[PDB]
């Protein structure tokens, strides 16, 4: 079979390998239909940053059960599934309480072990999530990214009837925008430096957009006046300036979910820090995309939205293609910005 | 009557002045029995932190109603009261929603108007909170400071059965320690650079103490392992280093209430910021000390705790004296830092 492997840095080869076999009673083999590229893979490929090389990445994928171990009885050949890439231990105090993303002894498909840029993959049963027969299998590769946004909403106790503000119009942000609309947010506002990403977000249901290269935080807070109550702000860009921005625009008692990891230090003036207190913000750190019971309601809601077609995936997809097409397109972007979602369709 | 007045650049003097008269129908006059100096008064006195000069400070006081305005029918001369120093407008959107501390046009006794370092004061009916007949009147001057920590607990949906960690062992933090113990925290931990203040904390029922000048954040976290869950951390020191420490030591899904205001900028490393996401912390900005119905359950609870003698005030008190010893004790803070509560007793 084929697979995409990248080595000490840059080089993305397309490889031939022995079909992987089931080696534990709790494993299943998946035949992969759709597998997408993540923002987090770019560093692993083009800035070192991967746990080892050569490696096979890919943790956003769907497909069909091809075989199951002697111990799995609730799955069967033909069953549609999406990959659940994190594997917590399930038995430590964090896991018992449902804090799987704070488990210290973890594996992760496509990072700590090879992933789904491949024709077949063997994973633990725990690492697949059954999908309805009625969901287009290809959209299955979007479930893990969608759950990023839903997990933040879950932590905030839901986006319903709230004035949600999404900061960052990348795939995560844009998926969050569509979910907020589908789940009955009172309003959805999108904030980004690109007027193009913003128009896109507007086409997804954001009733208004703020271009943060043109509009001031005050300017924004001014526009936000009528919707300053019950805010749920999602910071998805992961840069000091947008974390700072979220705090400065925040309405009274706004919830602030951080899903974006920083790679530069955060410098909050005493004034900005003061606004966290003065406004009585609740800042919610969000990690990964899971809850109890495993893998979490986030995965059911995501699956449901996808099956009842409330989401619009095409404008998010930059590339469809098999192993060479995908490899090349991955090489094309390099250390630059990701156009949109790059899908591997074997 | 006498009062204590501060002029520019640390000038402290005791003035003679005419007793205030009721001037609006909803006012009351209070003859003050006990009036304490707050940590936030220090910058107002020594570091040009006051809105105007000269000022009469004092927002932590109790006394008896001396007279009531024509429109007040629920209080009478002789009634024991504590001052509720914040005066929201009660008619803006924030106020209608109980966000009194986010009211944009609020007054504040001892900050935006002259306060209770004086024999008598005229304030609005909404600026006083009736005390029980039994309560020793001096204790009423602690109600306001007690409610600060109670307000952080309230925002965190309570301290019951939580492992609370109070960072900062000044008056505010030490009272929060006592309140946590009385309200049924599973455990209380105190953290401060002063071994002597930690012994004090331990006497108030903090089961263990960490000296932040002898112990690293990692070493603190190691000891906290068994108490890592259901943490409620109050940051009361208001310096960048203790805000950083609270995120660094925090256990999985800890609640961090920020009560201490910063007067320096906060520079957070990406790693530190990273931990807010990774531990899925909830960071709770706390402001002032009120909730609905005005002035809040905080006030009911503070009064009850005092009346049932669950609190220990004496070991928190550094100075008792009338206008001259009080004025001098304030001047002495310049060179001899504020080791405890300074009470003006007229
Ligand atoms: Ni991803
Ligand atoms: Ni800085
Ligand atoms: Ni105070
Ligand atoms: Zn675990
Ligand atoms: Zn108001």
Annotate A90-110 with DSSP letters as a single string. Answer: S-SHHHHTT-GGG-SS-EEBT
Spatial distance between the Cα atoms of B32 and B66, rounded to a whole number of angstroms:
10
> Would you call B283 an interface residue with chain A, using a CB distance cutoff of 8 Å?
yes
Nearest partner of A234 among A337, A155, A315, judged by Cα? A155
Spatial distance between the Cα atoms of A186 and A166, rounded to a whole number of angstroms:
13
Q: In 10 A of CB A224, how many CB atoms?
A: 20
Provide the shortest C-alpha distance from residue B102 to chain A (in Å): 6
Q: Compute chain B's Rg from CA coordinates.
A: 20
Which CATH number goes with the domain that contains A28?
3.90.180.10
Distances (CA, A) of B226 to A88, B111, B254, B276: 20, 43, 13, 20
Q: Which two tokens stand for residue B35?
A: 């009036």
Nearest partner of A257 among A155, A171, A143, judged by Cα? A155
> Would you call B195 an interface residue with chain A, using a CB distance cutoff of 8 Å?
no
Backbone angles phi, psi at B127, to 5 degrees: -95, 10
The closest CB to that of B273, out of A262, A273, A274, belongs to: A262
- Tell me how many domains chain B contains: 2
Ligand 4 center to A106 CA (angstroms):
7
Kindly report the length of chain A. 346
Q: In 10 A of CB B25, how many CB atoms?
A: 11
Domain of residue B167, residue span: 149-286
Tell whether B179 is in a known binding site. no
What one-character DSSP code corresponds to residue A127?
G
**What does the H/E/C string look like for B89-146?**
CCCCHHHHCCCHHHCCCCEEECCCECCCCECEEEEEHHHEEECCCCCCHHHHHHHHHH
B153 & B137 share domain: no
Helix pair angle (B171-183, B195-203), 10° resolution: 30
Which CATH number goes with the domain that contains B200?
3.40.50.720
Nearest partner of A241 among A218, A209, A264, judged by Cα? A264
B344 & B309 share domain: yes
Query: Resolution in A for the shown PDB structure?
Result: 1.9
| A252:B94 CB<8 A | yes
B80 & B136 share domain: yes
Nearest partner of B243 among B218, B210, B216, B272, judged by Cα? B272
Kindly give the residue spans of alpha helices, DSSP state H, lying in chain B.
Answer: 41-46, 93-96, 143-155, 171-183, 195-203, 217-224, 240-249, 270-278, 297-307, 323-331
A29 & A90 share domain: yes
Range 84-103 of A in CB contact (< 8 A) with B: 93-94, 97, 99, 101-102
Spatial distance between the Cα atoms of A120 and A115, rounded to a whole number of angstroms:
10
Q: Which two tokens stand for residue A29?
A: 């083999």
Which residues on A lie below 8 Å from B94 (Cβ)? 252
| A280:B282 CB<8 A | no
Spatial distance between the Cα atoms of B286 and A13, rounded to a whole number of angstroms:
53
What one-character DSSP code corresponds to residue B261?
P
A141 & A21 share domain: yes
Domain boundary, last residue among B286, B303, B332: B286
B153 & B294 share domain: no
Which residues on B lie below 8 Å from A94 (Cβ)? 252
A11 & A106 share domain: yes
Domain boundary, last residue among A253, A271, A286: A286
Distances (CA, A) of B299 to A70, B148, B174: 63, 10, 18
Spatial distance between the Cα atoms of A18 and A6, rounded to a whole number of angstroms:
18
Q: Are A63 and A130 in contact (CB under 8 A)?
A: no
B114 & B174 share domain: no
> 3-state DSSP call for residue B265?
coil
CB contacts < 8 A, A to B, total 121
Task: Report cis status (omega within 30 of 0) of the bond before A293.
Answer: yes
Ligand 3 center to B264 CA (angstroms):
20
Q: Which two tokens stand for residue B99?
A: 């966000």
Tell whether B89 is in a known binding site. yes
B44 & B67 share domain: yes
B144 & B22 share domain: yes
B33 & B133 share domain: yes
Nearest partner of A150 among A247, A255, A343, A286, judged by Cα? A286
| A102:B279 CB<8 A | yes
Tell whether B59 is in a known binding site. yes
Backbone angles phi, psi at A187, to 5 degrees: -150, 155
Domain boundary, last residue among B235, B269, B286: B286
A188 & A273 share domain: yes
Residue holding tokens 């603190």? B220
Provide the shortest C-alpha distance from residue A64 to chain B (in Å): 32
Spatial distance between the Cα atoms of B222 and A22, rounded to a whole number of angstroms:
40
């Amino acid at each position: 079979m084929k697979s995409v492997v990248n080595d000490t840095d840059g080089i993305v080869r397309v490889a031939e390998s022995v079909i992987p076999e089931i080696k534990h009673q709790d494993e299943v083999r998946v035949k992969i239909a759709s597998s997408g590229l993540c923002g987090s893979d770019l560093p692993r490929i083009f800035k070192n940053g991967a746990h080892y090389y050569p490696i096979t990445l890919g943790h956003e994928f769907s497909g069909y059960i091809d075989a199951v171990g002697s111990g799995v009885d609730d799955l069967h050949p033909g069953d549609a599934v999406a990959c659940v890439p994190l594997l917590p231990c399930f038995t430590c105090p964090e896991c018992l309480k449902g804090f799987y993303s704070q488990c210290a002894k973890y594996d992760f498909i496509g990072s700590r072990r090879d992933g789904g840029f491949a024709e077949y993959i063997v994973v633990k049963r725990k690492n697949v999530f059954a999908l309805p027969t009625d969901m287009p299998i290809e959209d299955g590769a979007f479930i893990e990214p969608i759950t990023v946004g839903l997990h933040a909403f879950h932590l905030a106790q839901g986006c319903e009837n709230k004035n949600v503000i999404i900061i960052g119009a990348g795939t995560i942000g844009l998926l969050a925008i569509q979910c907020a609309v589908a789940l009955g947010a009172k309003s959805v506002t999108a904030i980004d430096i690109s007027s193009e990403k913003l128009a896109l977000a507007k086409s997804f249901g954001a009733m208004q957009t703020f271009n943060s290269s043109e509009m001031s935080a005050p300017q924004m807070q001014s526009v936000l006046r009528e919707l300053r109550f019950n805010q749920l702000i999602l910071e998805t860009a992961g840069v000091p300036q947008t974390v700072e921005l979220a705090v400065e625009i925040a309405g009274p008692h706004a919830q602030l979910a951080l899903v974006g990891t920083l790679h530069q230090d955060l410098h909050l003036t005493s004034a900005t820090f003061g606004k966290i207190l003065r406004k009585e913000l609740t800042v919610i750190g969000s990690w990964m995309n899971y809850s109890s019971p495993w893998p979490g309601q986030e995965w059911e809601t995501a699956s449901r939205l996808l099956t009842e077609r409330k989401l619009s995936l095409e404008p998010l997809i930059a590339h469809r293609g098999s192993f060479e097409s995908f490899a090349q397109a991955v090489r094309d972007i390099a250390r630059n910005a990701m156009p949109g979602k790059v899908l591997l369709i074997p």
